[PDB]
Amino acid sequence: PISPIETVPVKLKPGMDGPKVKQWPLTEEKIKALVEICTEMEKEGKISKIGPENPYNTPVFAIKKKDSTKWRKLVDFRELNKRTQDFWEVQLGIPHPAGLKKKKSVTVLDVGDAYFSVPLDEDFRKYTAFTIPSINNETPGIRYQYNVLPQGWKGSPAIFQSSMTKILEPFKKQNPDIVIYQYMDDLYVGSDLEIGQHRTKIEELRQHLLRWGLTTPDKKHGYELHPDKWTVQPIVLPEKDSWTVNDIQKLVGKLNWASQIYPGIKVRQLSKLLRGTKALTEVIPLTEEAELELAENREILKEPVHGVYYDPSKDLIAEIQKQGQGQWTYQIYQEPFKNLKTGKYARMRGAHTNDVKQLTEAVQKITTESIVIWGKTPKFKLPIQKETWETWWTEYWQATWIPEWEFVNTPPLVKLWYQL
Amino acid sequence: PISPIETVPVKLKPGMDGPKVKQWPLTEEKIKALVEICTEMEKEGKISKIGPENPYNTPVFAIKKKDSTKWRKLVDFRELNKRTQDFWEVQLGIPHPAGLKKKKSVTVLDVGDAYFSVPLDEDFRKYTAFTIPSINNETPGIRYQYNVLPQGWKGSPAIFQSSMTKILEPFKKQNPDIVIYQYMDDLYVGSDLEIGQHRTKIEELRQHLLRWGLTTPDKKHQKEPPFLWMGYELHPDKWTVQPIVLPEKDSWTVNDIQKLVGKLNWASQIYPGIKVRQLSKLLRGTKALTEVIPLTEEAELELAENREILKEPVHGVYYDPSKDLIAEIQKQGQGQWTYQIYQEPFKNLKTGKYARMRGAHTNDVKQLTEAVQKITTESIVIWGKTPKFKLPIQKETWETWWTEYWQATWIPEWEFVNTPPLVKLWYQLEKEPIVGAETFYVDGAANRETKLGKAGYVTNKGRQKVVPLTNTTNQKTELQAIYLALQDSGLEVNIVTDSQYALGIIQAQPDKSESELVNQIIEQLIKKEKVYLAWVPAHKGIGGNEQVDKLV
Numbered sequence: 015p016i017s018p019i020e021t022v023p024v025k026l027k028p029g030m031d032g033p034k035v036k037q038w039p040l041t042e043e044k045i046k047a048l049v050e051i052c053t054e055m056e057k058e059g060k061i062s063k064i065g066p067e068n069p070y071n072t073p074v075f076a077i078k079k080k081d082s083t084k085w086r087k088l089v090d091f092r093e094l095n096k097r098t099q100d101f102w103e104v105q106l107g108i109p110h111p112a113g114l115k116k117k118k119s120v121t122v123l124d125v126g127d128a129y130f131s132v133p134l135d136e137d138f139r140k141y142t143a144f145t146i147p148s149i150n151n152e153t154p155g156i157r158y159q160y161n162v163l164p165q166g167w168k169g170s171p172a173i174f175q176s177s178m179t180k181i182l183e184p185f186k187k188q189n190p191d192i193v194i195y196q197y198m199d200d201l202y203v204g205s206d207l208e209i210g211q212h213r214t215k216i217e218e219l220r221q222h223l224l225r226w227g228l229t230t231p232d233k234k235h236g237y238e239l240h241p242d243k244w245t246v247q248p249i250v251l252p253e254k255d256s257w258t259v260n261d262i263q264k265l266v267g268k269l270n271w272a273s274q275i276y277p278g279i280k281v282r283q284l285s286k287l288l289r290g291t292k293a294l295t296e297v298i299p300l301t302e303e304a305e306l307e308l309a310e311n312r313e314i315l316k317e318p319v320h321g322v323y324y325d326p327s328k329d330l331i332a333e334i335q336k337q338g339q340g341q342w343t344y345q346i347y348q349e350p351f352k353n354l355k356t357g358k359y360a361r362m363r364g365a366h367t368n369d370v371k372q373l374t375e376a377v378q379k380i381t382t383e384s385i386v387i388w389g390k391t392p393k394f395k396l397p398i399q400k401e402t403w404e405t406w407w408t409e410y411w412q413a414t415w416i417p418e419w420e421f422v423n424t425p426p427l428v429k430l431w432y433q434l
Numbered sequence: 435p436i437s438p439i440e441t442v443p444v445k446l447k448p449g450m451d452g453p454k455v456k457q458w459p460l461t462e463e464k465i466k467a468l469v470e471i472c473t474e475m476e477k478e479g480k481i482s483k484i485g486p487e488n489p490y491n492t493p494v495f496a497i498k499k500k501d502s503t504k505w506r507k508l509v510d511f512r513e514l515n516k517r518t519q520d521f522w523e524v525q526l527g528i529p530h531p532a533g534l535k536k537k538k539s540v541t542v543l544d545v546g547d548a549y550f551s552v553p554l555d556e557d558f559r560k561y562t563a564f565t566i567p568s569i570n571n572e573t574p575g576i577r578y579q580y581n582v583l584p585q586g587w588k589g590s591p592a593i594f595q596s597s598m599t600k601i602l603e604p605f606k607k608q609n610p611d612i613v614i615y616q617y618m619d620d621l622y623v624g625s626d627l628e629i630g631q632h633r634t635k636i637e638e639l640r641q642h643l644l645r646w647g648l649t650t651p652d653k654k655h656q657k658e659p660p661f662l663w664m665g666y667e668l669h670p671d672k673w674t675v676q677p678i679v680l681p682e683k684d685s686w687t688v689n690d691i692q693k694l695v696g697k698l699n700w701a702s703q704i705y706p707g708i709k710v711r712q713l714s715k716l717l718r719g720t721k722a723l724t725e726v727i728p729l730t731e732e733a734e735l736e737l738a739e740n741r742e743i744l745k746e747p748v749h750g751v752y753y754d755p756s757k758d759l760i761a762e763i764q765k766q767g768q769g770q771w772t773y774q775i776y777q778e779p780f781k782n783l784k785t786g787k788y789a790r791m792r793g794a795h796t797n798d799v800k801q802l803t804e805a806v807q808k809i810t811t812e813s814i815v816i817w818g819k820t821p822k823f824k825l826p827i828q829k830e831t832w833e834t835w836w837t838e839y840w841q842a843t844w845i846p847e848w849e850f851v852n853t854p855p856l857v858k859l860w861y862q863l864e865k866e867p868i869v870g871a872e873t874f875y876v877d878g879a880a881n882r883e884t885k886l887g888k889a890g891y892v893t894n895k896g897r898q899k900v901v902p903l904t905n906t907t908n909q910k911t912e913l914q915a916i917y918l919a920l921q922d923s924g925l926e927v928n929i930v931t932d933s934q935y936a937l938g939i940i941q942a943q944p945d946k947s948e949s950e951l952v953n954q955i956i957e958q959l960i961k962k963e964k965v966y967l968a969w970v971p972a973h974k975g976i977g978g979n980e981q982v983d984k985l986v
């Protein structure tokens with residue numbers, strides 16, 4: 015009937031129970047797709063229907079690949095994760111190569127399918143249960159639980175880690191300068207070849223993987239990334255010629271908030287021109303003892319933070335601020351005012367690009383950056399409405415994972431971050 | 435009776451055992467009804483006398499109804515549930531009527547001893563164990579155990595609804611033309627066919643149901659057109675709120691208002707424009723349950739109107755799939771917006787209200803945004819898709835606000851609706867200073883203790899004023915200054931504040947506040963032609979701010 019079924023038995027550590035998360039209400043569109051998908055998986059054996067004797071449930075969504083033709087199921091295993099973590103991060107964890115962020119090109123390719131060939135630990139399948147919603151609560155939702163390593167679960171990879179690296183065993187010896195970090199379903203290939211060749215070694219691997227185990231990756235004659243290029247650090251102060259009282263004030267404050275990070279930021283002889291109750295539209299030519307601070311400080315602001323070191327026990331925070339015009343800035347950090355990275359996202363080739371869409375991309379962007387630089391996904395403090403977000407993101411969202419997010423209503427630094 | 439369904443494997447939380455509670459040997463006017471009943475169930479299989487074993491017991495009280503034949507044995511499993519494993523929590527939601535697709539002539543079914551017709555886990559039966567005392571006060575008690583769902587054992591609405599479904603599953607397939615809705619022991623088989631042929635089907639599901647152990651009533655199939663449902667009144671081509679009792683008293687309490695307002699919230703679904711802001715503004719004196727709460731002059735005026743609204747019955751329509759959904763809003767002020775989702779003129783599926791989020795500083799556009807939202811999230815439930823919006827604002831007014839709002843908003847797809855009031859931002863701040871306009875350097879502090887402050891200013895032209903304040907907060911003197919500058923200043927002005935707060939509140943362009951102070955400021959903004967507000971860090975040597983920063 016069946017062969018030697020050896021599955022890695024999984025456990026949640028003592029004190030935590032399977033996930034019990036409410037299934038979100040989806041558009042009749044997404045349901046129907048989610049309906050066919052499982053209908054087929056159930057048929058494939060990948061999943062099975064369950065009863066009321068499984069109190070467990072994780073949210074499941076539906077999103078387009080890039081193929082606004084066909085949908086793909088995206089289960090939000092954010093909870094089942096934290097409750098298995100001691101397993102996918104302790105026991106069978108996957109080390110993160112610090113060089114990956116150095117190579118000139120990193121192509122990220124999907125390996126999620128290599129997972130539906132590995133049976134899930136009997137006594138654990140019960141925690142991977144999900145419900146396919148019903149319009150207007152008409153009928154009761156549909157109940158399924160997995161039978162194979164499900165994508166999205168941070169264990170699917172940790173379990174596959176062996177079969178995987180074993181497949182990479184011939185390719186890695188032969189191409190010993192290429193980095194290959196497996197983060198969940200995604201596989202990151204990093205190297206330093208021509209942007210032409212780098213698309214060939216990939217293909218080699220692509221082909222290698224395709225044969226060896228039919229670990230079918232979804233390529234598309236396939237996601238180029240350039241780690242090195244990411245180096246956006248200055249915080250330019252407008253350095254004009256004509257300054258009004260008003261512009262000096264805007265500068266001091268914008269210069270004072272500043273010092274909350276950089277230690278040697280000295281705003282004194284600047285308050286020198288701000289002396290006297292003057293009109294705001296009054297040009298005051300910069301003094302002689304004055305522009306010291308202009309550039310003497312612009313310097314401490316030319317060379318970045320000294321004493322900012324990542325911590326693996328504390329998690330990562332990512333803040334994004336709408337900057338206007340498809341302009342979105344952001345900072346990654348841990349101890350308020352001690353950034354690990356800062357940058358900008360941009361709307362460039364889309365006349366249908368709206369806030370939400372941007373944010374959803376600006377986020378996935380920031381998430382991959384971390385996944386690369388740190389091997390871990392940050393927690394976002396999204397400047398959007400909790401209700402609106404929880405409705406639309408799965409629209410333009412098209413990643414295989416979901417980070418932690420919360421919602422904020424920003425203290426208007428005049429975003430002492432923008433340059434223009 | 436005894437359904438040939440397969441059973442749902444049940445257990446108890448890890449490390450627990452059956453409840454071994456005992457029977458307060460009670461009567462015989464009842465240690466009789468029990469033996470009569472049990473034995474009658476025992477025949478029907480619902481139960482089976484259990485051996486001289488280890489089984490734990492459960493209390494089996496009895497009570498009597500008021501129509502007359504006899505008593506009800508009511509076992510109290512409270513201690514069995516506590517030990518019973520959790521279950522996939524059934525539909526916690528209720529299928530709102532405005533979204534059941536219209537049909538020609540619907541039916542309804544009332545499953546019988548539902549719970550008692552579904553077999554119980556052949557292994558979790560031993561924990562249902564109980565006993566009724568002897569007919570005499572002596573004690574050779576009678577032992578039984580359940581073979582079907584217990585009547586309120588924890589897992590019952592679950593394992594029932596479960597099994598139900600897996601039965602209707604095969605029926606619905608051989609009949610892809612009938613939408614049977616399920617809720618408790620209620621089936622909503624309905625379709626649009628000659629009325630005669632249709633019955634041939636209902637009298638068919640019924641055969642199939644009874645075929646497998648589930649029983650259903652029958653005038654032939656029992657209910658006429660006016661159906662009741664969790665508070666609804668579903669006609670064959672219309673739905674409506676069941677009747678509402680909006681009382682008149684000479685005394686109300688914190689318990690009398692939740693009832694009122696609670697009754698008022700429900701009626702809004704279809705009753706257009708049920709204002710209930712001031713009435714709920716009351717439930718927060720303190721949360722004592724019984725309290726002589728004096729009606730307010732505003733509530734009694736609000737309730738008087740709510741009554742006049744209810745003094746006239748309104749209907750609700752059914753959902754038509756091919757036709758789409760349209761939703762339109764309208765602001766009643768005070769942050770009270772009302773809407774209505776429809777497909778056709780004079781035919782709403784439902785209307786509702788959108789309260790003000792009970793906050794402190796929000797402008798119409800914000801609210802209208804959150805309004806659209808509430809309606810969006812909701813339309814995706816009752817219907818499954820979002821509606822075309824008809825919002826009382828012009829694409830021009832919106833475009834402005836979002837492209838200038840630090841937050842990422844997303845009003846989806848609307849059309850203009852010219853019917854006042856029309857949502858609009860009343861005052862606007864100069865993005866840059868104003869040259870030939872006096873610059874007021876304001877600031878005003880207060881003693882956190884003595885609760886005494888003074889707001890004031892000092893300008894370029896050399897004018898100064900300090901107005902003494904009393905029983906004020908610090909933020910009060912902070913805004914007291916901006917308001918003071920707006921007073922003393924001319925037609926266009928530039929203000930410099932050390933107040934993060936003051937600024938933000940105004941730079942929020944939040945119209946419609948309660949706080950007299952804000953509205954005065956907001957009012958004074960309106961009157962001004964051009965205003966530019968500036969923020970500088972206080973206590974930082976501004977040879978121009980370290981003035982009022984020291985004068986106050």
Ligand SMILES: COc1ccc2ccccc2c1/C=N/NC(=O)c1ccc(O)c(O)c1
Binds near residue numbers: 543621623660662663
């Ligand atoms: C327990 O229920 C009642 C007791 C007494 C009544 C007296 C007069 C009218 C309706 C009544 C009702 C309710 N009758 N309700 C139904 O037969 C019904 C059928 C299909 C559905 O989908 C649904 O949601 C409710």
Ligand SMILES: OC[C@H]1O[C@@](CO)(O[C@H]2O[C@H](CO)[C@@H](O)[C@H](O)[C@H]2O)[C@@H](O)[C@@H]1O
Binds near residue numbers: 073417
């Ligand atoms: O979108 C937030 C919302 O998502 C829920 C599921 O309905 O939970 C998930 O997302 C959270 C985001 O911070 C995670 O922290 C949580 O672990 C995950 O299951 C809700 O709980 C939450 O309100």
Ligand SMILES: OC[C@H]1O[C@@](CO)(O[C@H]2O[C@H](CO)[C@@H](O)[C@H](O)[C@H]2O)[C@@H](O)[C@@H]1O
Binds near residue numbers: 776782
């Ligand atoms: O059909 C839109 C049109 O209907 C109007 C006036 O005829 O209002 C009536 O019809 C609406 C249809 O949805 C009802 O909601 C409304 O209560 C009723 O008075 C206008 O709203 C609009 O121009």
Ligand SMILES: OC[C@H]1O[C@H](O)[C@H](O)[C@@H](O)[C@@H]1O
Binds near residue numbers: 364375376378
């Ligand atoms: O135009 C769409 C693409 O724009 C940018 O590259 C985004 O970072 C990426 O997430 C998105 O796929």
Ligand SMILES: OC[C@H]1O[C@H](O)[C@H](O)[C@@H](O)[C@@H]1O
Binds near residue numbers: 545547548619
């Ligand atoms: O909800 C009350 C329930 O009482 C009992 O369990 C009955 O068997 C069932 O008909 C009903 O569903």
Ligand SMILES: OC[C@H]1O[C@H](O)[C@H](O)[C@@H](O)[C@@H]1O
Binds near residue numbers: 696700
């Ligand atoms: O919202 C309050 C109302 O909810 C439902 O209609 C209940 O059946 C009714 O008892 C209650 O008055």
Ligand SMILES: [Mg+2]
Binds near residue numbers: 878879932982983986
């Ligand atoms: Mg001050």
